[PDB]
Every structure is written in C-alpha cells, then in structure tokens.
Amino acid sequence: SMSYTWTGALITPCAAEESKLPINPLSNSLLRHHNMVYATTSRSASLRQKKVTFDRLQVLDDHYRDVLKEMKAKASTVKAKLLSIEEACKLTPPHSAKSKFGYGAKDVRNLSSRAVNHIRSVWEDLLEDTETPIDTTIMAKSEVFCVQPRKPARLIVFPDLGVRVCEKMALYDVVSTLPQAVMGSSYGFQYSPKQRVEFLVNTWKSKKCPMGFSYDTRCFDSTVTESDIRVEESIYQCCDLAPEARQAIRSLTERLYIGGPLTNSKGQNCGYRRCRASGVLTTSCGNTLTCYLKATAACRAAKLQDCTMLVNGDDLVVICESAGTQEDAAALRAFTEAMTRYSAPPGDPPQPEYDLELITSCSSNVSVAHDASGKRVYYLTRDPTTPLARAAWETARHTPINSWLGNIIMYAPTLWARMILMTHFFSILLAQEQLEKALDCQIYGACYSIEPLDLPQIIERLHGLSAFTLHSYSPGEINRVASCLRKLGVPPLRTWRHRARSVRAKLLSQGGRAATCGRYLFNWAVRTKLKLTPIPAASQLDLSGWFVAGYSGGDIYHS
C-alpha cells in the first residue's frame, strides 16, 4: 500500500528557520567557507515527500518464516517489566516537545499533577480503545550539512507527549532488552566504538578470505509495511508481560505503529502514514529487528557463506567467506533481489569489498594508528565534513543538542576530533568559563547531559588510554582529513597544533579536572610528552546503560 497519502496541506514550521551559517568570529576561526554550510528547513519538505511516498511490494518466503521462527524462539526467553509512571517520566527529555494538553516536558519530569492525570487517562484509553488511530504531528527535520558537487529535509513523525510517556511504560524495557536477546552479537547498539571495532576486526580476521559489504536500504522507514510492524509485534508478544502492557503493546501497534493520520504544526490534516513513524519508541528496535530478519533470510536466499552481520536499525553490514570475485558479485545481486522482495530495495547499489577499511557502516570505517609503543590500534573514523559543519553551526548558534560533544566522545581517537574538535571547543569553553557547564549531546538516539571536564574519564573508559596516545595515522585517513579542511575553509592541522599548545597551557594552569583535560586530551600537542597513567575517578563513573540499546527518535533521556 502507499507508504503515505497526502491531503495537499503543507508540512509547516512553528517558528522561523535559520538555514544559512552566520558570520560569527568564533565559528569563523573554525570554518571560513560559511556558505557551504546549510540547514534543511520545511521549505524542502515537498522534495522528501515525493521520495518517501511510493507503493510497497512484499513477497514473503520460507526463508523469511524460518528466520522469524528462530527469532521468536529467542524472544520467548525474555521477561519485560512495565515501567511506573515515575520511571517513564524521568526518561522524558527536559526539552521534549510539550503536549497539546496544557503541560510539557518539565511538568512531566516533575510528576506534576496535571501531566500525571493526562498520562493516566492516555494509558487507560490505550487499554480500552484497541482501534482508533492515534494522532501524530509531522515536522520537517532541521539538520546541518555541507553543499555537494542540497539534501531535502527528513520528515519526523511523533505522537503527543502523553502517548510518549505511555510508550515508555509499556515498551522501554522490551526495546532495551529484547533486541539483544534475539539478535545476539549481531545487535550493534550493545557495542561502544572500541567494542564495535573489535567485533569488526575479529570477524574479518576469522574468515579464511573475508568479503564484506554494507547495504543501504532506500528510505528504510517508508519501506516498512503494516505486515512488518505486525510481525515485529508478534515478537514483542513472545515476552512475558503484565496484562496492561500486553494490551498497551497491542493497542499501540494498531493505533500508532502500523500508521495513522498526519497533522502539521498548524493543526491541519496532511495525510496518512502506513509505514514506520520515525519518532516513536519502537523505531530503533523495530527497524533493527525488521532489517535483521530480512537480511538474514536474504543471506540464505543468496547463499552467502558463513555470514556475520551487524545491525543498527536500518544500517546493515555483512562479512562472509568469499567464494570468488565473480561468485561474490552474483551472490550480492541475489541478496539484493531477496531484500527487494522483502520490501527493502537498495538505495546505492551494494558493492563487495575485500578490504575492511573500505566498508562504511553507520557512517564510519576502520583505520589504523599506533600507540606510544608502536602497537597497531584499530579505531573508528569517518569523513569529518558533516561533523565539522555542525561544529561550526553549533558554535555560531545555541542549539538544543551538541553534536560536537557527541562526536568527541564517539571519535575521541580520530585525528580530527583530537586536533580540531577538542582544541576549538575547549578554547571557547575557557574564554567563556563554561568548562563546568553541562551540555546535552546524543548517543545512539539517547540524550545525555555531560560536563566537558569529564571527557577524559569518559574517553578512557570507552576507548582506553591509547585514545590519548594514538599517532602515526594511515596516509589515507590523513589525506581525507587534510583534503576536507581545505574544502571547508578550516585552518590546516599545523594551525590546530599551535592553538592546542595554548589551550593546554591554560588548562593546566587551572589545575584540577581542567589540568587533567589538558594533560590527557592535548598530550599530542607537546613533544616532551607526559607519561599518561590510568585516571582514578574514571572507573568510578557509572557508564552502565551507555551502550545497551538504540533509541533514535525514542524521546529517551537518562542522564
């Protein structure tokens, strides 16, 4: 059926939309070519609609059903708990979109009487009404990018804050625990960057002759069918659940997940969704499950040998035993026809790779570097263009989320993150004495509140001490970085080394946590390097729950 249907009304914005990168002194010392940095706005929604709207084709087969039975079997071992209104409220992000019922995020997080009563009533309605479609709002997503040799805004769809709190009560545990129990090592959100790199390399090294490929589904969300969502429910249904939870999941599937009416910010009727909503709690879990089910069966259909998959929602990467150049190519083509039949047509065409570093999954790839001793260290990196563009934008305007902080944490080992992201921002946090001001960043969809001064502990725990001593990067990584900076108008690396020397100096002067930041994060700036030893306060840090599950668009916040 059509993924979408439109009345004709337009996807509208609430407030104004900044699209051009301002001419700010602070951001300008970072990226001079400001006209190459733009932000999507509703003005291009039309273009996205035209692309995400289409008729879905799906033909299931024995392979699909065998894989589904296998997954259900594992699902059976799970026992999910219903969350208390309190627990679910504390998950609501402080800046989560307010409800159209006289209360918002803050009121929710605060167990305010009004908010709570509506939540109670919304929950009761989920238990009594098992059919009535549930309203959702549709917005043009505002994301920053660099021009190309422009991308239209993505569309987000989400129910009222009230329903969102109920989703958490009935599904937070399920989506935080089931993916793992079902997909085992193949579930990607269980791995921290280091861990993922480990899994990729060990896997690659275990194949007699490895062949790997990433597979890009053309607009995954709109490809998810009513059947996929029902099959996804059938899996949640194998869990042990409290009666009201089982009903809440049933009602939520029929009234929200499978589809429903779309309303713009003006309260007008935009159309109807019959595919995945990008802004619900089960979006990450559903997509990882759906994509895993289809890919596994497709691998069988294609006869790929001894496959090892890693799934992160719609992102998919596969490593298997090579059967030969020609064979692999045909096998990949088979795999693709299988996916197309399962309703997961390719975007870019999948290409077989025989060098791990060439494969790109989750927008990242493996690269090598050496530590103090010269030992080789695999780490995860990526073309730094988007990260940099957003760093500049986030520098010129105050934004709800700080991708830079999120990128430092996920790419702490990279050349650009250490030399650029670290220098620049610490430089600015000093000048404005906000090294202690906690900022919100995002990790796998979840919103985290973090103090920059904690970065050293965080980084050590998630990557190890080598993250502060990596050096002698591969030429390809260096060239991509250098090339990038030239393109964006960002000062060359030598200039960053100089700036870092200053930043570090000032940080050390301050002593305390700051002095540590300078000692660990910038040890690469000096030549008479210090001997970096384990940071005490690190392991004392509670990082459990940091790399357990994805929550992209799940309205999750536990910090």
From Swiss-Prot:
Activity is up-regulated by PRK2/PKN2-mediated phosphorylation. Changing I401V: In strain: Isolate pCV-J4L2S. The modification Phosphoserine is found at S29, S42. Binds 2 magnesium ion that constitute a dinuclear catalytic metal center. It catalyses: RNA(n) + a ribonucleoside 5'-triphosphate = RNA(n+1) + diphosphate. Changing C362R: In strain: Isolate pCV-J4L2S. Residues 210-328 form the RdRp catalytic domain. It is found in: Host cytoplasm; Host endoplasmic reticulum membrane. The N-terminus is phosphorylated by host PRK2/PKN2. Mg(2+) 2 binds at D216, D314, D315. RNA-dependent RNA polymerase that performs primer-template recognition and RNA synthesis during viral replication. Initiates RNA transcription/replication at a flavin adenine dinucleotide (FAD), resulting in a 5'- FAD cap on viral RNAs. In this way, recognition of viral 5' RNA by host pattern recognition receptors can be bypassed, thereby evading activation of antiviral pathways. Homooligomer. Interacts with non-structural protein 5A. Interacts with host VAPB. Interacts with host PRK2/PKN2. Interacts with host HNRNPA1 and SEPT6; these interactions facilitate viral replication. Part of the replication complex composed of NS2, NS3, NS4A, NS4B, NS5A and the RNA-directed RNA polymerase. This is RNA-directed RNA polymerase. It comes from Hepatitis C virus genotype 1b (strain HC-J4) (HCV).
